[PDB]
């Protein structure tokens, strides 16, 4: 079975806005959103359909650019960190599950150098 999406609402978390934050949205998130490769990663690995029982069992972290996304658009983190944590979380996932090589892993890589490239031009906090 699936587990629970990681939360995107939680009233006891601190959080807040920051022009970073709003920079990880309108740029990095929308970037690699409508790359050709998000697909996989535009929502929480179904492990039932996709047939892929052990992928829980290895993976105690998920998480996915749907999860990243409505983070984002709920205002849910406190700082630039916690989503660039997400991202790198999300691709350390896909190649710990996977090997090199493999479609998914090359999809991840190609995301990934499009999501260092973005990171490296965020703004100085306000
Ligand atoms: C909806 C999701 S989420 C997700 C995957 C898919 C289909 C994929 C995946 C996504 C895209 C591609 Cl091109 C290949 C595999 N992988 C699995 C992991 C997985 O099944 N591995 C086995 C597998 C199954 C099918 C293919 C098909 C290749 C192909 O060319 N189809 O014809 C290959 C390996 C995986 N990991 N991390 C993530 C994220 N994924």
């Given at each position: 079975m699936?587990?629970p ?8 978390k ?9 920079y990880?949205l ?18 929480p690995?179904?492990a ?10 290895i ?5 996915d ?7 984002l658009?709920?205002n849910?983190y406190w700082?630039a960190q916690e989503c660039i ?18 479609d ?6 190609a995301?990934?150098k ?6 490296n031009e ?5």
């Amino acid at each position: 079975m699936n587990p629970p999406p990681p939360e995107t609402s939680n009233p006891n978390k601190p959080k807040r806005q920051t022009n970073q934050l709003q920079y990880l949205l309108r740029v990095v998130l929308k970037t690699l959103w409508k790359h050709q490769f998000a697909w996989p990663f535009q929502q929480p690995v179904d492990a039932v359909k996709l047939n892929l029982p052990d992928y829980y069992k290895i993976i105690k972290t998920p998480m996915d650019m749907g999860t990243i996304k409505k983070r984002l658009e709920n205002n849910y983190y406190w700082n630039a960190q916690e989503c660039i944590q997400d991202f790198n979380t999300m691709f350390t996932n896909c190649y710990i599950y996977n090997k090199p090589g493999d479609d998914i892993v090359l999809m991840a890589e190609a995301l990934e150098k499009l999501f260092l490239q973005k990171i490296n031009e965020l703004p100085t906090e306000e």
